[PDB]
Every structure is written in C-alpha cells, then in structure tokens.
C-alpha cells in the first residue's frame, strides 16, 4: 500500500474496473490519513472529475462509496479545494446518491454536501439550487427518528445546520420555511449531538432581521430552547443561549415569549457559569431584556436577577463587566422610580463607580448615563442629597471630578453636568 499519486492515476485510467476500485481505495486511504492529506496533489492529478463520474456508477457501489469518501475529504479542505470539487460537478452527483438504497453511501453523500455547504453562503446556495433540501428531508420523514442509525442522523442534522448557516446573503426564505418543521422535530430528539446541531441551526436562523426571528418563534420552539438552556452539557447550552440571545434582540412580544417559557429561572447559573463565554453571552442577553418594557424589567426583579447582575459587574472579567454596565444603563433608562430604588438598595453604586477607572471610553459614557438616570429618579423623590452622599461614600465623587480631564468630549460635558447639578454649594 502507500500508493503514489502516479500509481493512482494509472489505475484509475485503466479500462479494468477492478484496478479502478483498487486505485480509488488507495486514493481514499491516502486522503484519510490523519495528517496532511496530499489534497493538492490529488487535484492537480485531475482525479476530481473521474471521482465525480464514479459517483454515478450505480453498479459498482463500492467505487461509489470510495469516491464519495475521497471527495468528502477533498471538499473538507480550503475554499480553493472545495471549489475544485464543485467545479468538478460533484453537487448534482451527491444529490443523486441521497436516494441510494445503500445507507452508507447515502450517509457519505450527506456528509460531502455538508462540507460543501459549510464553505460559505455562495456554495450553500449552490447546494440549495441543485435541489438538495427535498431528498435530505425525505431521509428524515420516518415517524420515529430513533430508527435511523445514530451516526446517520447526526450527519443529517449537521448538514441541515450548515444549510441554515452564514449570511450576506442569508439562506432563502423558501428554504428556511421548508427546513424548519424537520428542525423542530430534531430539537425534541434525545441525542446530545443532534440537539446541539439543531440549536446551532436555530441560532443561525435567528441571527438576522426580526422577520426571520418570527419565522422561528411562530414554530413554537422557545419552550424547548429554554429547556435546553437548562441542560448540563455545555455544547448544548452554548448554541441554545446563542439562540435565546438572538430572539430577545427582536420585539417586546418576542422577548416576552422567552420570559413566558421560564428563561429567567436559568439565568442565575448562566451568570455564574465557570465558562467566561457563557457569562458574557448571558449578560449581553440580560441587557436586551432590561431594554424592554417596564413589566419585563419587573420580571427580572421578581426572578431575583438584579443581585446577580451586580455580582457580574463586581467580580467578572472586564469584557463581561462591559456587558453588565450596558444592562444597568438600559435598566435605569427604562425602569420605574421604584425599580431604580431597588437597584440602589442592591448596592449598584459602588461597583459602578469602580468601573469609572476603566480606560475604555465607551463604558465610561455608559456609566455616566446610568448615574444621570438614577439622579433623575432621585429628583422625583426629592432625595438627590441622599444619593449624592452615597456616591461620595463609595469613592465615586473623586472619580467623577477626575473625568473632566478626560480627552473625550461627551464624557467631559456629562461629568461636569453631574458635578454642577448635584455636587455644588
């Protein structure tokens, strides 16, 4: 074994079918060895078109299988290499094999199409234009998904998820509406990996305009996304939290469906998750919720989440702290006077003042905005003096005075307004 590319070329070109099979096996072994498949050597030998033609040889199903595997591995490389597979006519040929009576050939064609679509929007739309969605969904048309082999079902879920992926442009609306019902079924399956890729698909489809968010929401997936948010497997929580985060960027009505499904009961553990990426994502999601209606801010209060946002603002890494500050600003600009009082009783002032030491200019503006909003609520109550002594007792007044020297302009004018308005006489 360890054939040379020249040996492979020789065997593939013969009129002997048995030597074509052996040569394709050698090519597949050469292309499936862990490190450095010599993909470019294979492309330059001109083998792609011949492999694509073998994909049609329904008689010799072994050479169909070996070709599909070789081409899967070529299509799994760079965009330039995936492009050679596409220019070789491979997409229609793989689509044809989706109907093969041999399950393992059909699976390998699903996998190859996943790699092609995974290259980007352009190749994803090619795959859809050649009509891949119908035969793919027909493979999942069985009433009980547990009858499919676990590996088969996983690859179908992964390839479907790649047809939902990427933007500029987003997938065509026709295709999304065709895929969503099957995606809903997969989201209720039990296999961890199926659930993870289904969540990734939903997170792709909800990454876009509110119109796309409504397509997914109207299918009823939010309660199951929330249940998967409470899972213990991090590869499920990550995409589920990504999807929930996208949905609460939409309207107050779409955000409310996330709250109605109970999402706020899971967020205390997300905001204290040991993985920094989860905390940051969950805090960002909280800032868009606190940007909603006053009654939705109130459900944040009632689920006891304010003390956890204060915790994040106090103890988290700086990038997550930025997100928490945004959630406070949004809270203080949209909240009632009684909600702001409660925010103050939770100890917001000090951790907020402490972040005014941050070099980052954007966050300083966010913080000053929150301070002004709280002062406006304090004016309604006639308690601006009480709030002003509180800011002095946290070390805050010195930091606000120091801001005058700041280079930025909006910071300069903002801090001077606060000092003249509440720290005079």
């Amino acid at each position: 074994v360890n054939w040379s590319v020249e040996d492979i070329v020789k065997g593939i070109n013969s009129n002997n079918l048995e030597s074509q099979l052996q040569a394709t096996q050698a090519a597949r072994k050469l292309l499936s060895r862990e490190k450095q498949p010599p993909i470019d050597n294979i492309i330059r030998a001109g083998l792609i078109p011949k492999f694509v033609s073998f994909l049609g040889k329904t008689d010799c199903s072994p050479i169909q299988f070996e070709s599909a595997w070789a081409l899967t591995n070529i299509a799994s490389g760079t965009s330039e290499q995936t492009k050679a597979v596409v220019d070789g006519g491979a997409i229609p040929a793989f689509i044809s094999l989706l109907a093969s009576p041999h399950a393992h050939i059909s699976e390998q064609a699903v996998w190859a199409l996943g790699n092609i679509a995974g290259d980007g929007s352009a190749f994803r739309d090619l795959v859809i234009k050649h009509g891949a969605i119908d035969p793919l969904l027909a493979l999942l048309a069985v009433p009980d998904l547990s009858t499919l082999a676990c590996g088969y079902l996983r690859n179908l879920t992964w390839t479907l998820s790649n047809l939902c992926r990427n933007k500029n442009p987003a997938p065509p609306l026709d295709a999304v509406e065709q895929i969503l019902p099957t995606l809903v079924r997969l989201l209720h399956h039990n296999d961890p990996e199926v659930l993870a890729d289904s969540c990734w698909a939903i997170s792709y489809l909800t990454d876009g305009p509110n119109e796309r968010i409504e397509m997914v929401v109207k299918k009823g997936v939010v309660p199951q996304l929330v249940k998967l948010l409470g899972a213990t497997e991090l590869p499920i929580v990550t995409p589920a939290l990504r999807a929930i985060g996208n949905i609460v960027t939409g309207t107050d009505e779409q955000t409310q469906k996330v709250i109605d499904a109970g999402a706020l009961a899971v967020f205390p553990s997300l905001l204290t998750n040991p993985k920094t990426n989860i905390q940051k994502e969950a805090t960002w999601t909280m800032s868009n919720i606190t940007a909603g209606r006053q009654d939705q801010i109130q459900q944040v209060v009632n689920h006891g989440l304010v003390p956890f946002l204060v915790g994040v603002l106090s103890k988290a890494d700086f990038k997550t702290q930025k997100e928490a500050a945004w959630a406070i600003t949004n809270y203080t600009s949209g909240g009632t006077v009684e909600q702001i009082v409660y925010l103050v009783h939770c100890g917001i002032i000090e951790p907020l003042m402490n972040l005014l030491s941050a070099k980052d200019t954007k966050i300083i503006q966010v913080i000053l905005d929150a301070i002004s909003n709280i002062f406006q609520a304090a004016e309604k109550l006639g308690e601006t003096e009480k709030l002003s002594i509180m800011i002095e007792e946290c070390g805050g007044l010195d930091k606000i005075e120091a801001l005058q020297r700041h280079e930025n302009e909006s910071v300069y004018k903002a801090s001077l307004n606060l000092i003249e308005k509440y720290f005079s006489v």
Binding site: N246, V248, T249, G250, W284, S287, N288, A291, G292, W326, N330, S333, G334
Partner: peptide
C-alpha cells in the same frame, strides 16, 4: 431602538 443586535460589530 434600545436593543443592540450587533454585539459582534461592537466587539
């Protein structure tokens, strides 16, 4: 609006 969709661009 008050909601931010572009956390990624915000970076």
């Amino acid at each position: 609006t008050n909601k931010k969709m572009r956390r990624n661009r915000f970076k």
